[PDB]
Structures are given as C-alpha cells and as structure tokens.
C-alpha cells in the first residue's frame, strides 16, 4: 500500500504518443499513475494505426495526443489525464517526476534527456523501429531503490536466544538458515520477552557453522522468555546512471550472454545509423528499400567502431546483414513489438516512481527479427510493402500485403478472456488476424466480469459487470476492428464438453491461443491441440514474471505440463497431522477453510434433510460435532435473533475456539503426556501448544472478536454497528462479563467422563427436542464462495483466525504475501507482464501464420521484469522415443481403419502385429480395459470375436455418438518399459 | 496416463500376489477402483478377513489413492467411513515414484500391528487408554458381525 | 578428461536469493534439478533452470553447457496466472 501511495500522486510525461507511447500510457493508466500528461503535435496517419489501439479511422489528420486522451481518461477515471498542447519547456519538467520519449528523434531525445538529467527527473527513451525495440533508462546520478529484489521480507521462528556478548541464538528447522546470509540487516519485529529487543533498532547478523546466528551484544537485555519472529530488512542500493549523450558513447546493455551483448551492440549501432540517416536525409528509410538499406549500412560503416565502449577492444566487425535487415523493415511499427516494449517501459516507469525493483541498467535491445521470412524464402518487396491507405500500413511495410492477406484468411481460437486474453484479443484486432470474410476468431470463457477484475482490465468498463466475459471481450474486439468476426462462447474447454468442441469445431480453426489461469486447463487444451494437430500459443504471468511459448506439431516439443502442480491445484488434505499439530500457514488456512465449509456450508443441508431418514449418531461422528457446534453461543432454549455485537456472544467464539478448546486439549494432552507411540519418548515433539487469555492490550484478539461478531451478523442477516468506535471503551471496561458461567461453557453442562450413559435417558430426549427447535430458523443458503467480495468480512476473520492459531501452536505468523496466494484476494496480473506476454504471443503468431517454418525459427520466451530478465530461446526438438522397429514422437498417432465391416479385436491385433511389427499386451479405451494378454484363455477367446465398437458399447454402455469419426484408446506391448508410453491408437470408426 | 500404469501395476501384482491378498479384482468398466481381500497374520485380527476398497484419483501417481474398507471396523487409526490416514498416502509424505505394493505392505504391517498415530475419534483414544479390553471386545464383535470368512 | 574434482556454482532462486552447489561436469542436469528441488522445497517438474539465457535439458550433462566455477544459474518456475 505505501508503495502505490507514491504512484497515486506521481506525475509522468509521455511524448511521441505513437503506438508505443499509447501502450506505455495505457499500462500507466491501468497501474494507477496519478497524473499522465500526453504530448504529441503530429497528426494521425495510416502508418500508425497498425499499432495504436486508441486511434480509429475517424481520428485521421487529428492530433494523436488529443484523440488518445479521450479513451485514456476513460480507462481509469481515477487517473487525471491531460494533454500538453504546446512545446516542451525546461520549467515544465520541474513538475514531472518521470518523462518518456517514445519514438522521438535523436536530437529531441538528447535535449530532453539532458534537461531531465540536470533537474534530476527520470528519463526513458523507448523506441521501436521494425522488429527491434530499443529502450533507454536514466534515473539520475543518485537514485535509491528501497526494494532491490521482488521478494517479501524473510521470516524465521527463533526457538531460543542467548543473553551473551556474542549473542548467538537458535532458530527452528527450515530453509531460512540457508536463506539468511551473513551481513544481512534484520529486525526483531515480534518476540515474547526481550522488551529491549522487541521492535528494536535494525541490527546486523552473522552466521557460522550449524546455523549459529551471531547477532551482537545482548547481555544487558532481559532474560529469554519465549520464541519469536525475526524479519529481514533489505538494504537500499544506490544506482548511478550516465547521461544520455554520455551513455550513447558507452552503451551498458542488459543481456544474458556475451554473444547477446555483441548482438545488442550491433543493434545499437544500427539504431544510431538509422537516426543519423533520418537526420541527414530528413526521412526514415522506405519500406524494404534496397538503396536506403545500403545507405544505412554504409553510414554504419563510416560510423567509427570505438563509439561504443572505448575502453573495450572491438569484439568483431559489425554484421552488415543485421544492420541491413533492421534498416529494411524499420519503416513500420508493429503491434506485438509495441506491446512488449511499452510493457517494459511502463515497468521501468513504475520502478522510477515507486522506487521498487532494480532499475534497468541504462540500455536494453529487444530483438524479434526471426519473424521475417526464412533466409531461403522470398523477401518482401517495396511494391508489396507500398502504402495503400489500409489501417495496417505499417505492418504491411514491415511484411507486405500478401502476408496481411494471409493473416486475414485465418481462423483462430482464443481460450480464456482474461487479462492475457484481453491483451491477446487486442493484439489480434490490431494485427488483423481473421479480419475478413474468409477468416474469423473465436473466444472461449466461462466467468462473468466482477468488480475486482475490471479494475485493471483493458477492455472492460464499469457497466460490464455481470455480463459474460467472452461476449464483452468479443464486443471490445469488434470495436477495435470492425472487420473482425469474433464469435464469443460461454462453454468452457474441459473434458465435460468434448461433444461441443469435437472434430467438427476444431476442423474449422487453424490455431489455438491459450491464456488460462490453471495448469490443468492448459494441459487439457494442449492435449486437444495435439489430438487435432493445431498450433498452440500459450502464455502465463505471475507478479512480474512472464512466459510465452509456441507449440507447433511435428516441429516443437509438446506442452509438458507440471503434473505435480496440476494435482496440487485441487487436492484433498490429510487433516490428521493438521488437526493434531499444524506446522505451516497452509495448515491453519486449510483448517479455517474446512471449518467454515463444514460449520456453515455443509451443515445447512446435512442437519436438515439428510438426518431425517439416513444415518445418525449411532454410526457417525456427530457425538463430537454437536458438542462443537451447539454451545458456541449458549443453550437459550431457542436460537436467538437479537443484535449480535454484545460482549457475551462476541467473546464466546474466541473463548471456545482458542481459549477453552486449547485449555481442554492441554488438560487432555499435556506437553509431558503426548503419547506419540505409547508412553512419552520425547513428549511435545518439536512444539508445545499454549492456551491464550483474551488480553485487551493485544489488538489482534479484539480485532478477531469484532470480526467474528461482524461475520456472524452478516451471515445471520442482522445489522451491526461500528464497534471500533467508543464502544471499544465499553468493551475494555468490562473484560469479565460472567465469571461464574465457567462450567456451562466448557463441555456440555455436567459431563466430565461420559462413562456408560451417565447423562441419563432423558438427556437424549432433551438433545433431540433442542435439535428440532434449532431446525426451525432462517433458511441458511449454501451460497457460493465470494471470491471478490472482500467487504463481507470473511477474509479479515479467516486471516485473523489463521494468524492467531499459528502463533498459538508455536508457528510464526503468516504475512499478507503468503495469504495472497489463496484464491481469496488473489493478486491480479500486472499490466506490464501481461502486455509483454501478449506481445511475445503476437510475435510468435507472426511466424505461425507464416506457414511451414523450421524449429530454429520459433522461440519460446520467459521474462522477469523486476530484475530485467528476458530470454528468447528456440524450443527443444520433439522427444523421439523408440521401441524395436517402432520409432515415434509425442505428435505421432496410430490411425487404424475399422473397415467396411468393423474389424474384430483379434483382427485388430493381427493387423497391428503384421503392419507395425509389435504385439500388444494391454489395450484399454481411456479408463475401461478391452484386451489383456494376461487374461484367462477363455475370457480372451470370448473377447476376440467381438468388434471393437461393440466391445466398447458393451463395456462403457455408450454408443458412439455422432461426430465420433475416430476412437482413441491406449495400448502397450510386450517387452516395453513401465515408464515409456506408446502413441495413442486412433480407431477410425 | 494413470489408467495404464494402474493396470500394469495390478497385472504385475496379480501375477504374484502376497499371501495376505485374495481374490483381488477390479471392474473393467472403471479400472481406477479395486476390490481385495486382506488376510491379517496377527491374532486376534487374523481370525477373519476384510474386503478393502482402494480408489485411484485421475492424477495418479501424482496424488495418493484412497483406501476404504467395505466392512465397518472399530479402530482408532481407521475412519468411520473406512478411510485410513496412512503415513505413506499422506500428502506431506507422498511420492509419485512409489508403488502400490509398498502401500499394501505398509497397510498389512499396520493391521498386523495397530499403532496409535492420530486419534481420529477422541473417544476411541480415551477408551483405548482407559479400558483396552472393551475395545478388543468391540473390535472382535465387529469382525464377527461384518467380516467375511477366511478362504483357502 | 576425467574432471574428478567438483566445482562450485551458484543457482539463483526465483525470490532474489541464491545458494551455492558443488557439482561435477559428468553429473546430469536432472541431478542438479533434484538438488535444487530439495534445497528450495519445490518439485523439479514445476520449474526448469537456465544458464546464459538458454534452458538446460535434463538428459544432457552439465559439461555441454560450458559451466564455469562460480557461474550463475536461474531457476524459472512455470506460471499459472492468466
Ligand atoms: O484468471 P484469468 O483472468 O487469468 O483466467 C483467464 C480466463 O480463463 C477462464 N478459463 C479458465 N479455464 C478455462 C477453460 N478450461 N476454458 C475456457 N476458459 C477458461 C477463466 O474464466 C478466466 O476468465
């Protein structure tokens, strides 16, 4: 929250508001920059509609900033967007904290950069020419970042500390010992005992053998009482950025290898040559003009080599081919490149504004020149790239009219209309993918827009809440491009809908773009794409991370999903150890979620309808569930309906769940009486539970009590006043409401040992009549979980419950970062990484549409914007497996026709043995087994004369529905390995 | 795929089953669920046999299977519905590289030597600590009233 | 060459911090993957690690990627958000 406070009031300037500047402005508006000031004097032309989404055809010959501001102010109404009509001035820069020069000329770049460097204003020089994009950063001579890395502060649980001059302490088992390094700055933000050390001044730490953490002088402090929590404090780092004119002569480029550094230096030389050509001749080079490219490369030749890193010897002569290629395509501006570079530039602006994350080390050079036609194919020509008034004029100048028509005659499938989905839809609309009668586009999504989603979505507006997400996305895409034919669908893509998305549907599409929020859905979509042999474009983001991959059948490796994470996405929990002794924040959060699910959701339907005619306490665990659920408030002879914020009712939940329950557990299982294996060996293994008394000085206990009261009032449909007001004084004035009611509120009313029905026969009748009375009441609906409605007070209650129970059980408190991982208040994707992955997917689309390309042409991507990490690497070749005569990859399949009469299973086995030279031992159709070599001879001889379709009808009970032109079934063969997998068998029905 | 590996494990196990397993069969309609007869080898549990049912989640082996006894039993380490909180099938200790034979051996040595790991029902633990003989009587009565005879 | 003596390299965790490892050039990449999985507490299938910007194949040996002592290797965890 404090980090975005600086962003909330910051003011930034965006100049040269072209497509790239439009992307930077959109990202800044989405992220919430307080004041965005545009600046563009030039009028809109055709050559920039291919990349700028804020300008339509109606905005031609109009000033770009003025037209863009109307939509920019509409993207986020809390962001004040203004346009600077005149020229830039030195005294205007005083009121700006960051300035961005997108695609500005070299002389203007130098002038504004020097002016900002003198006044200490962060300066960015993002520029995109062709398929390569240059970025420059200059945050000043003295810039301090308060968070050098994207990580929450480290937290560890110290088990014992020593009151000695060396100050060597001990901490609980964990990876924090391998994480805490010597020289770190740590603060003891919480500890039982050591009042001097509690919230003390920051102090260093030293580590030795056996995790011996040396802290310093602590002899004069109080005696050790109990363990606490130690928190890491990151040390701010100062960064020195050279001025633009000086940095141009000493380019410090961010890269991952020496070869990449040399390539980026060549790109920098090419950019300087382009700038000098534009200055000398007054115009940028013409699209794919041979003479202009020759002039640019000759200019780069006379551009003396020592202009870069004079202290560094010339690594190699500049590649003329690279400079020529950059010059040829430099005449156009592309939507994917604009999205990627604007994403990176906006992330750098956020770094400059909020001082978070490590700023870019001056220079960056994104390269995407592999999207051009192969070196052995035909190159675009100026006749093909000639301008003709199309909105895709720049893209045509880069690629040609034939490639644009090829893009138009394309049909694609978009799965998931999320942030990545919306950005992909924008990229498709701007590029022109299926922008014609011969093409089209499909959007698939199941969810509906909510209040917590559109706050950072690009295509959504305040009136779109409750409408289908796919429909709104399709409407926005049609608004971005009238020529686009987008068909939204509300049917998700999962195994339960294969009939809807069968072979008929997937025969229409030419490729699939996947933007999904789970690994299971990604794995399913990849499986479908492999089954139908359709290219897949997959991307995902998390925080400032970002991945973008392309999977071409028979070219690249199939999508290897992380099956472990897919399983862990939705898994049952063995709560036995969680209920006995929690050890992680996951344990306590799962405990709270399960308690809510059982007490409030599942109890409503089970206790009202199920118990009337089915099993009961005679064969169920209700004898303890009733004792846990009934005395939470009291007997009262009836379930109350009165005002719920009273002292007695609010404190009762905290007393029973955390005070009286823990006291009962301690008396039943004392720390010296833990029967781990029968009689204690080490009683209280590594932990010791401790009951807690409600102390008014502890804000967290009172906060939890008031949150529980508010939650109960909300779920019961009863009004609740603001108890955080002067009513807190009344709450603190009487911390003991009824000291004499200790016995009734502990366990039942008089039971201590139960024994053989000591309560009496009438006790069960009283319990039954009490249950019947409690049955009548409000109709508690098992309503769906509120994932985005944080105002219901559920989230505060569950967070407080987890943070108190973990501390009660000796576990260090859970921070907000760990709690944000859960579905509740899940962190939305940052606009920068989303735009970056969308741009990478568009860059891969430029090659997928281009037809047959080698694996050396496609390129998977992975980015981390916080540490300026970006890699583009060719994907691996398909995993070639082999077995005797048979050799296959992940894309191969065994297609076998059924014949005019359906071949019997014996005939199928004979055909396999004779054709592919292998004999099958096990053959099953998904989950039902058909044939087994290990089966008894009579059963095998019974199954052999049965036709495969007849056999699957007999077993599964479902006849082949229409559209099942092929049948997929798994087979294994004798002599194979247990881990190897044979290609699936496609049985052509 | 989970189904193929489950089928292969079932076939390899049935080609040489352990002595404490009889009539291990699976429904060909849904091969991800098994039925088996367990033969405890330690008295007084060895008096009869129990039919156990194990269900495999679709993401096997990346998710431990659930084992449920068809016949009701009165044990501290066995859930009321028949589920077992086995250490091997626990999520904190589960490993996909393990084989179902190891799980069966662990369950066999657990039923041949009952151990108080976690008191799923606190009354069961209290009664076992106070009067183990009544618990023995209840367990033997449950086996005699719900169990199946030991075949050969 | 036998390269009997192991060398020390640095593997960078996703959360900024890094740790040192002692490996052999004959050692397989999957062995490094399981080592960093045990140290970081994340299953080896959930992530992959890269050197000098290019990814490392599990079957391939460490020596083919040209690792040098005190090199830096970043682990890239697969992403779900969308
Ligand atoms: O959370 P998110 O914005 O990142 O997710 C993008 C969209 O993906 C939808 N979704 C999730 N899974 C599927 C499948 N299998 N098919 C179609 N849509 C799917 C979510 O509704 C989300 O909006």
Residue numbers in the entry:
A (entry chain A): 24 to 1012
B (entry chain C): 2 to 153
C (entry chain B): 76 to 157
Paper excerpt:
ISG15 is a ubiquitin-like protein that is activated by an E1 enzyme (Uba7) and transferred to a cognate E2 enzyme (UBE2L6) to form a UBE2L6-ISG15 intermediate that functions with E3 ligases that catalyze conjugation of ISG15 to target proteins. While Uba1 (E1) is specific to Ub activation, ISG15 is exclusively activated by Uba7 (E1) and specifically transferred to the E2 enzyme UBE2L6. Here, we present cryo-EM structures of human Uba7 in complex with UBE2L6, ISG15 adenylate, and ISG15 thioester intermediate in a conformational state that is poised for catalysis of Uba7-UBE2L6-ISG15 thioester transfer.
Although modestly ordered, the ISG15(t) projects away from the surface of UBE2L6 towards the ‘back’ of the complex where it sits atop the AAD, sandwiched between the UFD and SCCH domain. Analysis of the cryo-EM density reveals no density in the back of the complex that corresponds to the density present in the double-loaded Uba7-UBE2L6-ISG15(t)/ISG15(a) complex structure we ascribe to the ISG15(t) CTD. With respect to the ISG15(a) NTD/UFD interaction, these contacts may serve as a sensor for the presence of ISG15(a) in double-loaded Uba7/UBE2L6/ISG15 complex and provide an additional mechanism as to why double-loaded complex is more efficient at thioester transfer compared to the single-loaded counterpart.
